[PDB]
Amino acid sequence: ICDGDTLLLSTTASADTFRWISPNGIDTITTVNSLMIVPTNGTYYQSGDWTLITQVANNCPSEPSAPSSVV
Amino acid sequence: ICDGDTLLLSTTASADTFRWISPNGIDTITTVNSLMIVPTNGTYYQSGDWTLITQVANNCPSEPSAPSSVV
To answer: Strand pairing partners for B28?
Structure first.
């Protein structure tokens, strides 16, 4: 990703509480299978290994996804 | 596979419910030991590691096949 390119993290899962976990340790939560990270966002527009934990119509988290590398 | 080349995934198994699993996490089901993926199919015409789970005259899935890499 170049410095001016929006970072889009996404999944194949249908779920609630899709919690995207940043390489810095920042846990951000959405309702859709996508997280849009704006290039000016200094805490999420990072590069490294990202993971995802989700829930489906319940309060039980998914097994975390294998981390994936963002460049 | 070049961009204009049809992707054909196939097996040696005789089975029912041959479920082909895409690298994106998309589970598609056929009745024959073959899956034809058209070059314009943006969700299945991917490259990566694919696996297969099958059933034989029953409701019990096979042990998943070793993933194979599509280029």
So the answer is: B20
Which of B59, B2, B49, B56 minimizes the C-alpha distance to B33? B56
The residues, any chain, with a CB within 8 Å of residue A41's CB and separated by 6 or more, are none
Give B26 to chain A, closest Cα distance, Å.
Answer: 7
> Which residues, in sequence order, are CB contacts of B10 under 8 Å at separation 6+?
B33, B34, B35
Q: What is the resolution of this structure in A?
A: 3.6
Distance CA A46, CA A52 (A): 15
Q: How far is B27 from chain A (nearest CA, A)?
A: 10
Helix (H, G, I), strand (E, B) or coil at A4: coil
Q: Taking CB atoms and an 8 Å limit, are A13 and B24 in contact across chains?
A: no
